[PDB]
From Swiss-Prot, chains A, B, C, D:
Keywords: Biotin, Secreted, Signal. Homotetramer. Belongs to the avidin/streptavidin family. GO terms for molecular function: biotin binding. The biological function of streptavidin is not known. Forms a strong non-covalent specific complex with biotin (one molecule of biotin per subunit of streptavidin). This is Streptavidin. It is found in: Secreted. It comes from Streptomyces avidinii. The chain holds residues 40 to 159 of 183 of the full protein. A motif (Cell attachment site) lies at residues 44-46.
Amino acid sequence: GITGTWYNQLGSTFIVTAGADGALTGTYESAVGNAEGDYVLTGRYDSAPATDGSGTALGWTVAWKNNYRNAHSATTWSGQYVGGAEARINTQWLLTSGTTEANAWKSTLVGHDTFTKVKP
Amino acid sequence: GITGTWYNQLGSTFIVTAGADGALTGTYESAVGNAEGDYVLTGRYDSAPATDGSGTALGWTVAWKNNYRNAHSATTWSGQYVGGAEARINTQWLLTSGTTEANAWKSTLVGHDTFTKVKP
Amino acid sequence: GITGTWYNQLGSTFIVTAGADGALTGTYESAVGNAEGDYVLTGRYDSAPATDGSGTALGWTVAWKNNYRNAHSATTWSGQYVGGAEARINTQWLLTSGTTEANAWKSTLVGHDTFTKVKP
Amino acid sequence: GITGTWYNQLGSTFIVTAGADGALTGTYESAVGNAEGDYVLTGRYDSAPATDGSGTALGWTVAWKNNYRNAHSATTWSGQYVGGAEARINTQWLLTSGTTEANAWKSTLVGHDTFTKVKP
């Protein structure tokens, strides 16, 4: 039940299709950072998860280049999907920027997002 | 630059194809963890990187399910490709396992990987 | 502001004393993991925070050894204290277990914690 | 064998004493960021680690305020010590800054450092 629209706490929006194979493909609209419009997203998910109640592991990447801006950065979300009345995708994320060698050490931001099927 | 076979510090291999559109595709074989054989890889990279000597932002995911195993988990690498005599893909990763709600707190491991174009 | 008893989202408690010098001292009791009883806590915080409405940078460590248990691991929380009607300590943490070299790759878990001044 | 001077790959220097109890106390000189001089560091370590070859879990915090600058930030290192000819402390780190609420999402940098008993 991953296919559809999801909203994080910060008002960001993404749409995705979860293929029967394990493909995640869709769009991400970010409500923060140097971003404007929709950005392509692609990732993977466990298409045959544990049947003991455990969530479904997944992950996806968005490169912050589109027709509007190019932040020269990229975020990957790593987390799991959990079904039910209060369905949510809980993730941790890493945002790496292209940096010179001198600045590499501070190239990566880390955060956490919680996505739900309704807006905050 | 990015397209080709890559090797990390631990014995893992990473064969990737960089699309003109910013797409990352390929297969991954992990030397560690609950894995064996090839796994699908999907990601994105900045197809118009800055020209100031900055690295090239990218990310990809691998879900650890293939025809032989399912670890009920996914790893995302977030990083930057760096050129030179010694080109590298410089990454940090998160590995999230599908868990129950009462084990969600210890769901995600974090680490780093350096990919070089020659075997360790 | 920071000195006092704090509670996270999972049932853990965090009693801390903020020194004038920037020192953080106290005891922690974890509701999760390989833990029971009180554990020593030591850390630091910015004793001269900016006045522009910014949070107050801080961090502390707890090694999971006390007179009753030893989990051969340590957790560091990195975060910022935020004032208001609803003061919070906003954190991300890394939990590193002592491992063998061939398990060093899966040594560290990453997560986040929100500490409030009232019980969950 | 933690007590003494350690150098990371980036030329940073720290000195520490590991008390028989589990106390880490000392100084950190950073070779990167908005830092000048020595900064106080405090943390914890496992003072009775596993006797199977496993490393010794530890963690420490530095608040980036001293007599020279105040970056209004703080780093926590989480990792393990490993003895032997090639002794090293391998860590992951989190650098949180005080931010307004609007900017909290990007308040934390993440990296990895490897410390040795001799300079790079």
